[PDB]
């Protein structure tokens, strides 16, 4: 008799440029032929839903209802409801879900930290992280692109959001990039883009090179 | 009715300098005569539980318990079971917790702040990158010339598993400090204690003198009439 | 008729992480049918020992016995008594050994090698100086990269009180390294252990050029019109 719903975060909408509504109903009795539907605040009908998940091997039934709409409807303020109806249910339960509004809105600050000098001494690998702090809300999406070509999602893992101790309403995140030491010698800019709902373009990247953190080495002056 | 028993994490052992295991009962009604105890592999005298809770906001009753054991009798494979004889359950509830993997020495690296970060002259962040270690639950803290900092100042991160390495983990630890408190000192040695090192505890420190790789310059002067004494 | 006893040194509880008490039985006649064991002031069960020593050819009784205990029992205040009964001396000989019941943090000052040693192009000596710590009997070890070196590579000097401060001590520990291995760019950190630091473990690392950037100011003059000055 447990009902849950995962709201569509900004990190998932930015992937396919389209929001998706999902509902997770677990801790129920294993039975088939379960009707899952979505109802709006005004009762307007929703689009066709399919791709219903099966039951878990541990005697747990899970039903997922997919519904794709535009970002304007989700940002307008309309509230949805994951209605679950079945024979064993004495009454059709309801659960509302929407986008919480009324929080802070600060533009993210990207600080691409250069790799440490001692890391390159081993000549084994090199982990370049992208420090992003001072943003609201949390759960932002970051990735890496190789001269415009995105890399595989497996290489980079987004750190879990966590509130900043020195800030009342800001968060921070990390995104490492494990690459070989010999690779970061002929370019490898590794632009760190950030997805947030405060920037005018919602995307901000930084361009670096091998001689980024190293200051000038020559100061030769000519006197004539 | 579920009973949990959180094993003593390595982070709490080093900080408190004393091991302490907790085994409490949950999902129980508001009944009295609820006693708890500790049973070892063979069964001997244990420490009496103290600091009993009162109640919970969700209309339930619980009783936590702590004991005092040694550190050598934990990594040898010994098990500790907290047997609770509930009044409403004819069968006593027993929870056995113990410890068993590969061991890799952690790698400690300190990342200096970026050049563009100091241009704002608002705050400075120092990250001590720790990667390639096993198992998880590693405690990372910061100090200042031998004086430890308050736990509210520095906050560690979660032990996210390394994607490239199938059996390693990486952690992060930020330290937001003022911009003016960086060019006059504040080494902020990154002290980290792990259970896969010959010396257990290791620490590394960085400062502003780590850079400037012999920034030399040669004055090229020719066909000039200065009339001075070099 | 005197039974010696070796107190648990701080240098022995860190290298092996196992504090064990041992009382040396000497100055007695060599005979069989003897009872050697350990007793505690509390009055609980005490583990026995093994590895009985041989017989001294100079007609001197010798016996060694060690038992494995925990680490918090010695620091709590519990006393351990080693009583040995001999046929010639029926009177028991009680040997109560306990740490004194009553402190400054050590300072690691890694002295860089001089230039005269490198001029001979034979070897290089790196010493680690630690001053201002109490009490004595500390442990100094050397580690390379991520593993310790051989025990014979470095020898730790005996503790000696500071002639200036009556409540401070100092220790010395040198290390032999070739010139080629010194200019490679290694660390050769000095990690010690003390019973007063918040983490009890500290280490300091250096490099070939870690003190100052050592910038240059050389000027190249190729003008034949600018005269010189005496
Ligand atoms: C060389 O650099 C130093 C420090 O950067 C500076 O003081 C000196 O004036 C420079 N030499 C010349 C000829 O400008
Ligand atoms: C080198 O610099 C020092 C101080 O910067 C100065 O005293 C000295 O005269 C300089 N050498 C020459 C040859 O001018
Ligand atoms: C030494 O550095 C000073 C700047 O501090 C500069 O004025 C002088 O010309 C330098 N001496 C040389 C280049 O011989």
XYZ file of C-alpha atoms and ligand atoms in Angstrom:
726
model
C 0.000 0.000 0.000
C 2.921 2.297 -0.844
C 2.723 4.902 -3.619
C 5.657 6.980 -4.867
C 6.454 9.283 -7.775
C 9.813 10.609 -8.988
C 9.442 14.180 -10.307
C 11.276 14.914 -13.571
C 14.516 16.616 -12.557
C 16.319 19.135 -14.751
C 19.134 16.636 -15.386
C 16.718 14.230 -17.112
C 14.707 16.728 -19.178
C 17.883 18.184 -20.706
C 18.893 14.748 -22.042
C 16.112 14.211 -24.601
C 14.835 17.833 -24.604
C 11.471 16.563 -23.334
C 10.136 15.994 -19.831
C 8.655 12.652 -18.787
C 6.335 11.764 -15.902
C 6.961 8.456 -14.124
C 5.249 6.768 -11.177
C 6.759 4.016 -9.012
C 4.269 1.794 -7.162
C 5.989 -0.996 -5.213
C 5.375 -2.973 -2.000
C 2.102 -4.363 -3.384
C 0.706 -7.815 -4.116
C 1.894 -9.648 -7.235
C -1.059 -9.418 -9.625
C -1.381 -8.696 -13.335
C -3.924 -6.615 -15.291
C -3.361 -3.383 -13.356
C -4.771 -0.153 -14.793
C -2.485 2.881 -14.439
C -3.661 6.318 -15.564
C -2.723 9.973 -15.113
C -5.213 12.681 -14.131
C -4.603 16.426 -14.254
C -5.856 19.046 -11.802
C -8.727 20.028 -14.120
C -9.421 16.418 -15.129
C -8.178 16.811 -18.704
C -7.320 13.542 -20.431
C -3.667 12.617 -20.910
C -1.863 11.021 -23.844
C -1.545 7.276 -24.376
C 0.673 5.434 -21.889
C 2.410 2.087 -22.372
C 5.556 0.152 -21.388
C 4.322 -1.174 -18.045
C 6.997 -2.831 -15.921
C 6.652 -6.408 -14.693
C 6.855 -7.799 -11.147
C 10.081 -8.303 -9.214
C 11.378 -11.832 -8.510
C 11.107 -11.074 -4.763
C 7.268 -11.039 -4.826
C 6.876 -7.317 -5.494
C 4.805 -5.768 -8.288
C 5.983 -2.537 -9.922
C 3.960 -0.460 -12.392
C 5.513 2.412 -14.357
C 3.425 4.813 -16.421
C 5.258 6.954 -18.970
C 3.789 10.255 -20.154
C 5.690 12.761 -22.301
C 4.590 16.410 -22.401
C 6.193 19.771 -23.131
C 8.221 21.794 -20.643
C 5.667 24.631 -20.640
C 2.990 22.468 -19.000
C 5.334 21.313 -16.227
C 6.587 24.852 -15.543
C 3.084 26.365 -15.651
C 1.954 24.901 -12.326
C -0.350 22.061 -13.342
C -0.500 19.236 -10.793
C -0.754 15.573 -11.791
C -1.950 12.504 -9.907
C -0.793 8.884 -10.180
C -4.075 6.986 -9.828
C -3.817 3.229 -9.229
C -6.935 1.054 -9.477
C -7.115 -2.699 -8.910
C -9.547 -5.324 -7.652
C -7.786 -5.859 -4.313
C -7.717 -2.114 -3.584
C -10.764 -1.170 -1.458
C -10.696 2.381 -2.864
C -8.654 4.113 -5.594
C -5.882 5.993 -3.804
C -4.487 9.278 -5.113
C -1.073 10.931 -4.883
C -0.276 14.420 -6.161
C 3.065 15.543 -7.581
C 4.213 18.857 -9.042
C 7.217 21.184 -9.228
C 7.974 23.011 -5.952
C 8.164 26.769 -6.500
C 9.428 29.427 -4.114
C 13.120 28.620 -3.692
C 16.315 30.558 -4.368
C 17.661 31.026 -7.902
C 21.408 31.664 -8.192
C 23.578 31.189 -11.262
C 26.101 28.338 -10.921
C 29.817 29.066 -10.617
C 32.175 26.727 -12.487
C 35.780 26.334 -11.284
C 37.599 23.788 -13.462
C 40.403 22.658 -11.161
C 43.568 21.683 -13.066
C 45.023 18.234 -12.340
C 47.643 17.938 -9.627
C 51.331 17.844 -10.515
C 51.965 14.663 -8.508
C 49.301 12.796 -10.503
C 51.300 13.114 -13.738
C 54.517 11.891 -12.084
C 53.255 8.298 -11.877
C 52.609 8.260 -15.661
C 49.613 5.967 -15.107
C 46.416 8.049 -15.245
C 45.083 11.572 -14.733
C 41.781 12.532 -13.086
C 40.562 16.023 -14.021
C 37.579 17.173 -11.959
C 35.196 20.081 -12.558
C 34.194 21.867 -9.348
C 30.745 23.488 -9.544
C 29.445 25.368 -6.504
C 26.994 28.120 -5.645
C 23.779 27.113 -7.396
C 20.126 26.585 -6.511
C 18.374 24.199 -6.822
C 20.608 21.105 -6.753
C 20.758 18.047 -9.055
C 22.390 19.678 -12.069
C 23.695 17.871 -15.152
C 27.332 18.066 -16.271
C 29.319 16.170 -18.890
C 32.465 16.331 -21.020
C 32.923 16.901 -24.754
C 35.957 16.049 -26.899
C 36.189 19.056 -29.242
C 32.405 19.020 -29.582
C 32.018 15.231 -29.478
C 30.428 14.058 -26.200
C 32.087 11.214 -24.329
C 30.501 8.036 -23.012
C 28.388 8.485 -19.849
C 30.306 5.687 -18.101
C 33.585 7.634 -17.924
C 32.174 10.513 -15.846
C 29.933 10.092 -12.793
C 28.094 13.061 -11.294
C 28.605 13.442 -7.551
C 25.587 13.390 -5.265
C 24.231 16.851 -4.365
C 24.995 18.211 -0.910
C 24.331 21.607 0.721
C 27.301 23.924 1.134
C 28.254 24.420 4.811
C 29.196 28.070 4.188
C 26.059 28.883 2.165
C 22.411 28.947 3.302
C 20.854 28.049 -0.042
C 23.637 26.865 -2.350
C 24.950 23.418 -3.270
C 28.080 21.896 -4.793
C 28.905 18.988 -7.083
C 31.906 17.163 -8.525
C 32.607 15.398 -11.821
C 35.938 13.596 -12.247
C 37.344 12.398 -15.584
C 39.794 9.481 -15.455
C 42.094 9.678 -18.490
C 45.567 8.383 -19.278
C 48.554 10.600 -18.522
C 49.863 10.479 -22.102
C 46.500 11.589 -23.532
C 46.554 15.074 -21.957
C 49.559 16.242 -23.975
C 48.247 17.294 -27.431
C 45.120 19.238 -26.517
C 42.250 17.615 -24.587
C 40.466 20.827 -23.655
C 37.724 18.913 -21.782
C 35.108 21.660 -21.713
C 32.911 21.390 -18.606
C 29.332 22.371 -19.442
C 26.737 22.992 -16.730
C 22.950 22.674 -17.007
C 21.022 25.042 -14.743
C 17.800 27.063 -14.767
C 19.329 30.444 -13.860
C 21.817 31.076 -16.656
C 20.561 33.055 -19.679
C 21.654 30.199 -21.969
C 21.519 27.428 -19.312
C 24.934 26.276 -20.600
C 28.376 27.524 -19.538
C 31.678 25.918 -20.534
C 35.334 26.650 -19.795
C 38.245 26.208 -22.211
C 41.650 25.211 -20.818
C 44.883 23.730 -22.162
C 48.103 22.134 -20.929
C 49.556 25.500 -19.854
C 46.488 26.730 -17.970
C 47.500 26.772 -14.301
C 51.192 27.271 -15.056
C 52.147 30.978 -15.161
C 54.529 32.560 -17.662
C 57.991 30.985 -17.714
C 59.946 33.624 -19.671
C 60.322 37.296 -18.723
C 63.122 38.306 -21.103
C 63.312 42.058 -21.711
C 65.085 43.797 -24.592
C 67.033 47.016 -23.978
C 68.344 49.062 -26.902
C 8.768 -5.794 13.276
C 12.330 -5.050 12.149
C 15.522 -4.829 14.214
C 18.613 -3.027 12.915
C 22.205 -3.089 14.166
C 24.536 -0.516 12.595
C 28.149 -1.744 12.732
C 30.727 0.705 14.122
C 32.059 2.640 11.139
C 35.772 3.377 10.870
C 35.046 7.118 10.725
C 33.503 7.119 14.209
C 36.206 4.888 15.712
C 39.066 7.247 14.837
C 37.187 10.401 15.863
C 35.887 9.111 19.206
C 39.059 7.037 19.826
C 36.793 4.289 21.200
C 34.762 1.638 19.394
C 31.015 1.639 20.036
C 28.384 -0.553 18.372
C 24.664 0.240 18.407
C 21.802 -2.261 18.107
C 18.255 -0.960 18.589
C 14.787 -2.409 18.003
C 12.155 -0.753 15.808
C 8.489 -1.216 14.868
C 7.186 -1.951 18.364
C 4.145 -0.828 20.330
C 4.116 1.243 23.532
C 4.788 -1.564 25.999
C 7.070 -1.789 29.022
C 9.470 -4.492 30.277
C 11.694 -4.237 27.190
C 15.258 -5.354 27.929
C 18.278 -5.728 25.647
C 21.609 -7.507 26.015
C 24.688 -8.600 24.070
C 25.769 -12.153 23.238
C 29.176 -13.075 21.830
C 30.189 -16.287 20.049
C 30.610 -18.145 23.356
C 28.796 -15.878 25.822
C 30.494 -13.849 28.555
C 29.981 -10.664 30.556
C 29.038 -7.594 28.515
C 28.535 -3.882 29.197
C 25.171 -2.647 30.442
C 23.322 -0.472 27.938
C 22.927 3.202 28.850
C 21.288 6.340 27.435
C 17.860 4.837 26.785
C 15.533 6.863 24.572
C 12.025 7.951 25.575
C 9.784 7.687 22.490
C 9.458 8.650 18.826
C 7.118 11.077 17.029
C 5.614 8.221 14.963
C 4.026 6.448 17.974
C 6.584 3.732 18.672
C 8.968 2.655 21.427
C 12.665 1.851 21.057
C 15.661 1.221 23.304
C 19.196 1.780 22.027
C 22.252 0.114 23.516
C 26.036 0.465 23.544
C 28.892 -1.624 24.926
C 32.690 -1.495 25.222
C 34.782 -4.077 23.361
C 38.354 -4.303 22.081
C 39.681 -3.461 18.624
C 41.698 -6.672 18.203
C 38.560 -8.825 18.638
C 36.799 -7.235 15.637
C 39.044 -7.852 12.609
C 39.694 -11.490 13.599
C 36.213 -12.613 12.524
C 34.416 -12.466 15.876
C 30.667 -11.840 15.817
C 28.419 -9.968 18.251
C 24.696 -10.744 18.477
C 22.178 -8.582 20.356
C 19.442 -10.932 21.579
C 16.152 -9.198 22.431
C 13.389 -11.194 24.147
C 10.258 -9.309 23.123
C 7.172 -9.870 25.263
C 4.746 -10.006 22.322
C 6.950 -12.410 20.317
C 7.484 -15.955 21.666
C 10.579 -16.313 19.461
C 13.522 -14.125 20.551
C 14.902 -11.747 17.930
C 18.614 -12.143 17.167
C 20.755 -9.956 14.897
C 24.280 -11.149 14.074
C 26.734 -8.552 12.744
C 30.362 -9.206 11.802
C 32.969 -8.464 9.130
C 34.353 -10.578 6.241
C 38.001 -8.197 -0.252
C 40.973 -6.493 -1.889
C 42.952 -3.819 -0.041
C 44.528 -0.884 -1.884
C 46.464 2.005 -0.376
C 44.637 5.346 -0.734
C 46.150 8.049 -2.933
C 46.214 11.542 -1.413
C 46.294 14.566 -3.725
C 45.672 18.246 -2.976
C 44.333 20.531 -5.706
C 45.445 24.175 -5.476
C 42.767 26.818 -6.090
C 42.295 28.025 -9.644
C 43.735 31.333 -10.819
C 40.357 32.721 -11.906
C 38.775 31.800 -8.558
C 40.992 34.256 -6.658
C 40.130 37.112 -9.041
C 36.699 37.503 -7.426
C 38.381 38.038 -4.021
C 35.333 36.585 -2.250
C 36.192 33.036 -1.148
C 38.734 30.272 -1.710
C 38.085 26.528 -1.915
C 40.686 23.785 -1.429
C 39.856 20.213 -2.459
C 41.850 17.200 -1.239
C 41.314 14.535 -3.895
C 41.424 10.987 -2.503
C 41.009 8.155 -5.014
C 41.929 4.498 -5.329
C 41.090 3.020 -1.933
C 39.064 0.170 -0.455
C 36.770 -0.317 1.385
C 34.424 2.687 1.607
C 33.549 4.848 4.646
C 36.815 6.789 4.893
C 37.092 9.767 7.249
C 38.721 12.908 5.820
C 39.299 15.995 7.967
C 41.243 19.259 7.867
C 43.586 20.998 10.304
C 45.404 24.334 10.557
C 49.035 24.276 11.752
C 48.218 21.343 14.022
C 44.884 22.776 15.191
C 41.873 20.766 13.956
C 39.010 22.725 12.433
C 35.377 22.623 13.495
C 33.224 19.928 11.838
C 30.788 22.604 10.631
C 33.494 24.306 8.549
C 34.659 21.368 6.412
C 32.226 18.781 5.036
C 33.304 15.594 3.259
C 31.522 13.881 0.349
C 29.927 10.485 -0.325
C 32.007 7.398 -1.203
C 31.076 7.251 -4.880
C 32.623 4.159 -6.520
C 35.238 4.739 -9.194
C 33.763 4.116 -12.670
C 37.031 3.179 -14.395
C 38.382 0.977 -11.598
C 36.050 -1.964 -10.818
C 37.298 -2.206 -7.226
C 38.300 1.298 -6.130
C 36.553 4.343 -4.683
C 37.086 8.100 -4.730
C 36.150 10.807 -2.237
C 36.158 14.602 -2.090
C 36.547 17.184 0.670
C 36.044 20.904 0.065
C 37.124 23.725 2.380
C 35.623 27.163 1.709
C 37.915 29.820 3.208
C 38.446 33.534 2.697
C 40.626 34.825 -0.130
C 42.806 36.908 2.203
C 43.433 33.826 4.390
C 45.466 32.048 1.685
C 48.445 34.279 0.801
C 49.582 34.635 4.437
C 49.649 30.963 5.467
C 46.880 28.460 6.277
C 48.589 25.355 4.931
C 45.502 23.233 5.744
C 47.179 19.832 5.882
C 44.886 17.108 4.521
C 44.952 14.426 7.222
C 43.151 11.194 6.314
C 43.031 7.910 8.240
C 42.543 4.639 6.361
C 42.725 0.964 7.325
C 44.948 -0.050 4.376
C 48.222 1.713 5.189
C 51.327 0.678 7.149
C 51.035 3.899 9.183
C 47.200 3.971 9.048
C 47.052 7.785 9.192
C 48.659 9.881 6.451
C 48.709 13.606 5.747
C 49.983 15.942 3.033
C 50.193 19.732 2.885
C 50.511 22.324 0.121
C 51.117 26.070 0.094
C 51.728 28.970 -2.293
C 55.411 28.019 -2.713
C 54.568 24.825 -4.630
C 54.439 26.840 -7.869
C 56.855 29.218 -9.594
C 59.035 26.563 -11.319
C 62.236 28.649 -11.374
C 60.792 31.619 -13.259
C 64.077 32.938 -14.637
C 64.712 35.790 -17.059
C 67.780 37.052 -18.930
C 68.248 40.773 -19.599
C 69.351 41.182 -23.225
C 70.949 44.623 -23.628
C 73.054 45.617 -26.634
C 74.055 48.827 -28.432
C 72.965 50.846 -25.387
C 74.823 53.745 -23.751
C 73.824 53.599 -20.081
C 77.069 54.738 -18.446
C 76.523 52.797 -15.210
C 78.474 50.306 -13.085
C 77.141 46.744 -13.163
C 66.782 -12.932 43.211
C 65.547 -10.029 41.076
C 63.048 -10.557 38.247
C 63.283 -7.979 35.470
C 60.329 -6.649 33.488
C 60.260 -4.820 30.146
C 57.535 -2.138 30.025
C 55.604 -1.822 26.749
C 57.485 0.813 24.769
C 55.643 3.191 22.457
C 57.889 2.106 19.573
C 56.754 -1.524 19.934
C 52.993 -0.831 20.038
C 53.028 0.913 16.633
C 55.261 -1.261 14.434
C 53.352 -4.447 15.322
C 50.097 -2.918 16.673
C 50.097 -5.454 19.523
C 51.014 -4.456 23.080
C 52.306 -7.447 25.058
C 53.748 -7.591 28.572
C 56.909 -9.576 29.289
C 58.886 -10.131 32.499
C 62.451 -11.431 32.219
C 63.393 -14.034 34.836
C 67.120 -13.811 35.613
C 69.488 -13.895 38.605
C 68.092 -17.277 39.665
C 69.266 -20.878 39.751
C 68.620 -23.106 36.737
C 66.143 -25.798 37.785
C 63.018 -27.464 36.428
C 59.499 -27.688 37.931
C 58.759 -23.956 37.894
C 55.461 -22.091 37.517
C 55.437 -18.912 35.410
C 52.193 -17.073 34.648
C 50.566 -13.637 34.603
C 48.026 -12.185 37.029
C 45.792 -9.112 37.000
C 44.667 -6.825 39.807
C 40.992 -7.163 38.837
C 41.040 -10.943 39.259
C 39.876 -12.288 35.894
C 41.164 -15.019 33.600
C 44.648 -14.363 32.206
C 45.982 -15.971 29.038
C 49.136 -18.061 29.411
C 52.361 -17.710 27.393
C 54.789 -19.855 25.402
C 58.208 -19.783 23.695
C 60.285 -20.740 26.726
C 63.870 -19.525 26.429
C 66.917 -21.792 26.569
C 69.411 -22.197 29.430
C 72.370 -19.862 29.853
C 75.666 -21.818 29.748
C 77.005 -19.550 32.532
C 74.612 -21.071 35.121
C 71.847 -18.469 34.920
C 68.120 -19.147 34.724
C 66.382 -17.511 31.760
C 62.681 -17.396 30.918
C 60.581 -15.209 28.615
C 56.791 -15.012 28.600
C 54.492 -12.756 26.576
C 50.694 -12.549 26.497
C 48.434 -10.775 24.007
C 46.052 -8.204 25.509
C 44.071 -5.213 24.276
C 45.291 -1.624 23.938
C 42.766 0.205 26.149
C 43.541 -1.874 29.256
C 47.037 -0.421 29.680
C 45.832 3.173 29.255
C 42.837 2.690 31.572
C 44.987 2.227 34.678
C 44.859 -1.519 35.265
C 48.076 -2.943 36.716
C 49.644 -6.235 35.632
C 51.601 -8.414 38.065
C 54.101 -11.107 37.042
C 54.886 -13.531 39.877
C 57.486 -16.292 39.493
C 57.853 -19.093 42.048
C 61.119 -21.035 42.274
C 62.047 -24.138 44.254
C 65.033 -22.426 45.887
C 62.962 -19.285 46.625
C 59.434 -20.277 47.728
C 58.557 -16.632 48.434
C 56.642 -15.155 45.465
C 58.213 -12.149 43.739
C 55.510 -9.655 42.772
C 56.398 -7.477 39.761
C 53.822 -4.697 39.366
C 54.369 -2.751 36.131
C 52.216 0.247 35.221
C 52.668 3.440 33.242
C 53.170 6.640 35.276
C 50.023 8.705 35.821
C 51.409 12.047 34.707
C 52.888 16.799 27.593
C 53.629 18.710 24.385
C 53.132 18.020 20.696
C 56.229 17.034 18.684
C 57.566 19.186 15.857
C 59.059 17.500 12.788
C 61.955 19.521 11.333
C 63.306 17.659 8.296
C 66.741 19.147 7.636
C 67.649 19.204 3.924
C 71.050 17.754 2.991
C 74.002 20.108 2.687
C 75.956 20.905 -0.479
C 79.374 19.636 0.643
C 78.166 16.021 0.735
C 76.928 16.224 -2.866
C 80.270 17.656 -4.030
C 82.076 14.379 -3.286
C 79.618 12.537 -5.587
C 79.682 9.499 -3.284
C 76.432 9.459 -1.276
C 73.958 11.710 0.537
C 72.764 11.871 4.147
C 69.219 12.960 5.023
C 68.421 13.434 8.714
C 65.117 14.126 10.471
C 65.218 16.290 13.601
C 62.301 16.263 16.057
C 62.480 18.624 19.035
C 60.093 19.750 21.748
C 58.174 16.629 22.748
C 57.454 14.687 25.932
C 57.812 11.987 27.113
C 60.754 10.072 25.611
C 60.794 6.677 23.839
C 59.258 7.707 20.529
C 59.270 5.855 17.198
C 60.778 7.263 13.993
C 60.419 5.494 10.644
C 61.149 6.278 6.999
C 58.850 5.492 4.074
C 59.306 5.707 0.305
C 56.427 6.453 -2.084
C 53.880 4.201 -0.387
C 55.915 1.467 1.299
C 58.439 1.499 4.156
C 62.142 0.953 3.593
C 64.376 -1.738 5.059
C 64.966 -1.613 8.838
C 68.748 -1.496 8.326
C 68.567 1.565 6.052
C 67.857 3.916 8.981
C 68.753 3.719 12.677
C 66.885 5.706 15.332
C 69.050 7.309 18.004
C 68.343 6.963 21.707
C 66.211 9.661 23.370
C 68.026 12.421 25.236
C 66.604 15.343 27.247
C 67.127 18.813 25.837
C 69.856 20.707 27.749
C 67.894 23.966 27.426
C 64.354 22.881 28.336
C 64.260 20.363 31.228
C 60.886 19.021 30.063
C 61.657 18.459 26.381
C 63.428 15.743 24.402
C 65.002 15.398 20.968
C 65.684 12.516 18.591
C 67.854 11.968 15.522
C 67.405 9.635 12.551
C 69.663 9.674 9.491
C 69.156 7.955 6.139
C 71.680 6.894 3.498
C 70.756 7.573 -0.133
C 72.809 7.847 -3.311
C 73.104 11.087 -5.265
C 71.306 9.619 -8.288
C 68.279 8.620 -6.196
C 68.188 12.080 -4.575
C 67.954 14.109 -7.805
C 65.296 11.809 -9.295
C 62.488 13.735 -7.599
C 61.370 11.446 -4.781
C 59.988 12.508 -1.385
C 61.694 10.565 1.449
C 59.174 11.711 4.036
C 59.783 11.512 7.791
C 56.786 9.921 9.536
C 56.851 9.566 13.327
C 54.368 8.592 16.046
C 53.585 10.239 19.378
C 51.041 9.799 22.173
C 50.009 13.477 22.310
C 48.975 14.481 18.778
C 45.236 14.525 17.977
C 45.892 11.982 15.203
C 49.077 10.495 16.787
C 50.700 10.276 13.314
C 52.460 13.090 11.455
C 54.753 13.291 8.442
C 56.655 15.945 6.492
C 57.684 15.609 2.844
C 60.203 17.612 0.814
C 61.586 17.635 -2.727
C 64.688 18.707 -4.635
C 63.382 22.299 -4.899
C 60.670 22.819 -2.274
C 61.932 25.665 -0.071
C 62.019 28.651 -2.421
C 61.485 29.108 -6.174
C 65.071 30.450 -6.455
C 64.446 32.820 -9.347
C 67.276 34.245 -11.446
C 68.273 37.791 -12.392
C 71.070 37.133 -14.900
C 71.781 39.853 -17.473
C 73.462 39.242 -20.835
C 75.535 42.185 -22.101
C 77.015 42.210 -25.614
C 77.862 45.920 -25.930
C 81.499 46.882 -26.513
C 80.924 50.577 -25.724
C 79.872 50.186 -22.071
C 83.049 50.165 -20.000
C 83.675 48.282 -16.776
C 84.178 49.517 -13.216
C 86.761 48.414 -10.659
C 63.418 39.458 -14.026
O 62.348 39.047 -13.161
C 62.398 39.632 -11.851
C 61.256 39.032 -11.064
O 60.189 38.640 -11.916
C 62.314 41.152 -11.956
O 62.443 41.719 -10.657
C 63.415 41.679 -12.867
O 63.259 43.081 -13.058
C 63.369 40.973 -14.219
N 64.457 41.426 -15.070
C 64.342 42.460 -15.911
C 65.564 42.793 -16.713
O 63.299 43.097 -16.020
C 72.418 41.313 -7.951
O 71.263 41.680 -7.185
C 71.570 42.174 -5.872
C 70.250 42.423 -5.181
O 69.156 42.239 -6.069
C 72.433 43.428 -5.978
O 72.791 43.863 -4.672
C 73.687 43.138 -6.792
O 74.426 44.337 -6.994
C 73.317 42.534 -8.143
N 74.513 42.188 -8.893
C 75.055 42.989 -9.817
C 76.290 42.473 -10.492
O 74.570 44.082 -10.094
C 67.949 42.485 -10.880
O 66.547 42.666 -10.637
C 66.153 44.045 -10.567
C 64.686 44.063 -10.208
O 64.485 43.775 -8.830
C 66.451 44.739 -11.894
O 66.125 46.119 -11.785
C 67.923 44.579 -12.255
O 68.168 45.112 -13.550
C 68.322 43.106 -12.226
N 69.743 42.955 -12.496
C 70.224 42.494 -13.657
C 69.204 42.130 -14.696
O 71.428 42.376 -13.859
